[PDB]
Design a protein around this ligand. Structure first.
Ligand SMILES: *[C@@H]1O[C@H](CO)[C@@H](O)[C@H](O)[C@H]1NC(C)=O
Ligand SMILES: *[C@@H]1O[C@H](CO)[C@@H](O)[C@H](O)[C@H]1NC(C)=O
Ligand SMILES: *[C@@H]1O[C@H](CO)[C@@H](O)[C@H](O)[C@H]1NC(C)=O
Length: 291
């Protein structure tokens, strides 16, 4: 018995599809045999506890482009086979309770982009051992706490761009041994801890453009054995003695890198640090280390 104006069909997967119907709540009577539930484009403001618990075989659930303001901590309880979860484009969600994703051990992709998220609570991504793709871009994040991604040993793509992250601490990206792509551009990153990328030996793409970096210790990039694509443009680089280690690393990098445009000193403005001679990097500009 297909509920409301929903469309129900069996092939290729048992599906209940109710998009863009002005629904203000999760409809009652969703067939328990459903493998895919599409509830995107509605006006759903709240997801109550155990809203899909009847659906033992659910693998795909879309709730994007709704009006979500609150998700109950037990909203996804009993969804042990869930592989894809889409909560994106709910700009007033602001906050997800840290236990909300517990028991989703088959989850492969999690869409949380444009959810207005203010923070990543302790244990929010705990136990998501199968997760491969995590989308956190275009939110309101102000911090990247240590060990936030510690259990995500299978994650290959992490999207964190378009937030307000001020820095990267040492253990922010611990546990991410499979990470392939890390996008951190369009943030406020003013400093990266020397050993922040220790676990990212398989990383192939790193975007750090449009941030607030004036220098980078060479130790930051040393672990990145597999790196092929690097973006560092649109940062206020100081091209003086402090930039020598980054310069030296860039000389031996066999991958592709963006411009690394000097902001200071004036005579080097918009020249590419990558393309300077060592002699250009003598003295202090207008303190740390060599200065
Ligand atoms: C889940 O799938 C199995 C195998 O098709 C079936 O026996 C079971 O009834 C399904 N569960 C629900 C709630 O429909
Ligand atoms: C991680 O992926 C590999 C293959 O890519 C798979 O064998 C393994 O079971 C996955 N880990 C978990 C915890 O699901
Ligand atoms: C970059 O960091 C400096 C402090 O070193 C701060 O004064 C400035 O406002 C920051 N820029 C942006 C765009 O946040």
């Amino acid at each position: 018995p297909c509920p409301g104006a929903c469309v129900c069909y069996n092939e290729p997967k048992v599906t209940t599809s109710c998009p863009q119907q002005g629904l203000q709540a999760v409809p009652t009577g969703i067939p328990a045999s459903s493998q895919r539930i599409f509830l995107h484009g509605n006006r759903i403001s709240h997801v109550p506890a155990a809203s899909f618990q009847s659906c033992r075989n659910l693998t795909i659930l879309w709730l994007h482009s709704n009006a979500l303001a609150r998700i109950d901590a037990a909203a996804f309880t009993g969804l042990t086979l869930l592989e894809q979860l889409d909560l994106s484009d709910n700009a007033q969600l602001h906050v997800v309770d840290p236990t909300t994703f517990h028991g989703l051990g088959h989850l492969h992709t999690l869409h949380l982009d444009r959810c207005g998220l203010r923070e990543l609570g302790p244990g929010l991504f705990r136990g998501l051992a199968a997760l491969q793709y995590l989308y956190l871009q275009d939110n309101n994040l102000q911090a990247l706490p240590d060990n936030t991604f510690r259990d995500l040993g299978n994650l290959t793509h992490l999207f964190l761009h378009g937030n307000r992250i001020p820095s990267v601490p040492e253990h922010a990206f611990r546990g991410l041994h499979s990470l392939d792509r890390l996008l951190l551009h369009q943030n406020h990153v003013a400093r990266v801890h020397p050993h922040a990328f220790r676990d990212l030996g398989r990383l192939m793409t790193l975007y750090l453009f449009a941030n607030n970096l004036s220098m980078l210790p060479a130790e930051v990039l040393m672990p990145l054995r597999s790196l092929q694509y690097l973006r560092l443009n649109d940062n206020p680089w100081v091209c003086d003695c402090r930039a020598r280690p980054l310069w030296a690393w860039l000389q031996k990098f066999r991958g592709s890198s963006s411009e690394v445009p000097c902001n200071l000193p004036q005579r080097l403005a918009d020249r590419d640090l990558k393309r300077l001679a060592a002699s250009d990097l003598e003295g202090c500009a207008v303190l740390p280390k060599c200065c």
